[PDB]
Amino acid sequence: QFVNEWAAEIPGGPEAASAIAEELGYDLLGQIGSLENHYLFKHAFHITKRLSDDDRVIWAEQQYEKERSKR
Amino acid sequence: YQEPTDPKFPQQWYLSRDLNVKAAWAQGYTGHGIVVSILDDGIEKNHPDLAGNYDPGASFDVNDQDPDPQPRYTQMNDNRHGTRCAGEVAAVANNGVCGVGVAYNARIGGVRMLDGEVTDAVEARSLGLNPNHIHIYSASWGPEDDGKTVDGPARLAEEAFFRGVSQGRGGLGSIFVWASGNGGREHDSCNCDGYTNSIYTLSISSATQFGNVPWYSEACSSTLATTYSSGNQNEKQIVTTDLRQKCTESHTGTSASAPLAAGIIALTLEANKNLTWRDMQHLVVQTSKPAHLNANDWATNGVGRKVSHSYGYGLLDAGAMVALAQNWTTVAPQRKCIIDILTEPKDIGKRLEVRKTVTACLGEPNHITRLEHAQARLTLSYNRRGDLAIHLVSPMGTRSTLLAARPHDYSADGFNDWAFMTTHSWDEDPSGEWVLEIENTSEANNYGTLTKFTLVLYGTA
Ligand SMILES: [Ca+2]
Ligand SMILES: [Ca+2]
Ligand code: NA
């Protein structure tokens, strides 16, 4: 169900997301689609919480597989 | 004008009781300059009827993290769907192979994103791929059509939808063409599908060759228009490109309607490239034809337009779409009026009716006199969600069915700020008394509480 990917909203920009990755011990995979300030991290509510509590992260969430039907 | 000579074109009954696509072709509109991307399980870019129109700039493989969206080949041909939808849009014409696409001169791309773990992030990557190169995104997928699921786009996908219509296509807005669903057999209601229920997506339903509601069709108030698709075994189906460079005459379901709609919109965008994502929806509302579409719920709304919960505003008319687009005047900026209705929680019980006279943000910058989408954001508890039927009546008297009884939905979680959307009061005056109806359709002793009812209005002044 859950995967080893975390999405975080970081208003500081890519430089901020880069420092976030280094300090906390994550892998910055980059910007998510066209969402300028939404980034995906590789490294688990504790892993999610650590990201959210940072004052540079406004929103964080672990990715999880969803059932999607073709019509 | 010389019509296509492709071998399977005469079998494309839905092109030229049809979608009036030939009429758009004769006006000079075949889709040149328009880019369309299929968000699905991949696209056979080397297919002899797709390669000539293939565009790598509209394609990506999200599942395997690489530019090539080639489908994964298996014994059962599980990954043929994306290729079938792509051929409906932009299959090459007059090359003696299979048939033609609706916009046979458009560039076609594909995002391989269903052949793997589909997360919130995966959906957002696909909806936001190269938004100033891709004009139209065609997607037939959504939550399970089991008749008991209430699911929609999560935060990332939801944001990607908004980012697309706000800043995509140089600000005109990405066109998201969506399929309403295949849960007919389970008595599903596509307002429980957050992707088609979205105001950002152009929801399309299906009609059989004989003009009937197909067995898989889902009824809801969020559907906008209808294109032809499969029906019973006496009715013809959709002829398109198939996996392994083959041709198929048995493409079925509501996934065969959305790409046809995207192709017609691709024809429309060639006739007017300045059309916004809202302009395109206005054009569909105005030109769609209810004639010869059989439904027992055809109702005339406040502006005199026939509207159905199975068909929306009717069949897409490509000739009428391109004709109105040429001289269409861009609509005014969208306004969003939020009106909190409930002053206290209400007990549902057997039947609940909520009446409220609203001013539609009168005196404010969000004053609305011409309605587009209308939303009823409901937070309620109930012991058996499937027994609920919810209706919303606009001041003009237009009765919108927000939720129909879902006999398989035994959930007790109710709804949490779920935005039931309706397109049936389009162009109405939202000023006046709005009525919400929530009733228990079963004979059982059911109970629950409506704790929040936010009426969200979209439109212009
Ligand atoms: Ca062909
Ligand atoms: Ca459904
Ligand atoms: Na929609």
Numbering used by the authors:
A (entry chain D): 30 to 72, 83 to 110
B (entry chain A): 110 to 125, 130 to 574
What do the authors say?
Indeed, we could obtain crystals of M5:furin and M2:furin at pH 5.9 and pH 7.0, respectively. Four and three copies of the PC1/3-prodomain:furin complexes were observed in the asymmetric unit for M2:furin and M5:furin, respectively. The main difference between M2:furin and M5:furin is found for the secondary cleavage site loop between Lys73 and Ala83. This region was well structured in M2:furin at pH 7.0, but no electron density was observed in M5:furin at pH 5.9. We also applied crystalline material of the M5:furin complex on a gel, showing that the prodomain was intact. Thus, protonation of His72 at pH 6.0 will change a productive interaction to an unfavored contact, probably destabilizing the conformation of the secondary cleavage site loop. Consistent with this observation, the last amino acid with visible electron density at the N-terminal end of the secondary cleavage site loop in M5:furin was His72. The structural data suggest a specific destabilization of the secondary cleavage site loop at acidic pH.
Proprotein convertases (PCs), including furin and PC1/3 among nine mammalian homologues, mediate the maturation of numerous secreted substrates by proteolytic cleavage. The zymogens of the furin-like PCs share a multidomain architecture comprising an N-terminal pro-domain, a subtilisin-like catalytic domain, and a P-domain (also called HomoB-domain).
